[PDB]
Design a binder for these strands. Structure first.
Ligand SMILES: [K+]
Length: 86
DNA sequence: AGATTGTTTATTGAGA
DNA sequence: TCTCAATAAACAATCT
């Protein structure tokens, strides 16, 4: 049987920012961001289709998130995302 | 191909 | 009314 959780009081900027700040390298992949968010806020275990679309939109749309490429000799899926140094 | 990641554009909704 | 946040969606790049 399923259970209603209430949306926590954070914008996607805030959610992403917190995820990154917490990370030991100060950077996370997109899927790591998803993980951190879901692990912590069970509200986000539903409707993953739309809220993840929002996250992706946020990373690209907002200048405060910076794409870090993976090393040539350490390849993988997607880039890391860190905070713009502003 | 098939899915994930990323970008971009347009709309919509909420709150001041 | 107007800005900004969130949503929806089209389409490309890049992984599996
Ligand atoms: K960006």
């Amino acid at each position: 049987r399923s259970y209603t959780h209430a949306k926590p009081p954070y914008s996607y900027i805030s959610l992403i920012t917190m995820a990154i700040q917490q990370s030991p390298n100060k950077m996370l992949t997109l899927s790591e961001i998803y993980q951190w968010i879901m692990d912590l806020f069970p509200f986000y275990r539903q409707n993953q289709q739309r809220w993840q679309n929002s996250i992706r939109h946020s990373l690209s749309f907002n200048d405060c998130f910076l794409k870090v490429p993976r090393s040539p000799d350490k390849p993988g899926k997607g880039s890391f995302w860190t905070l713009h140094p502003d």
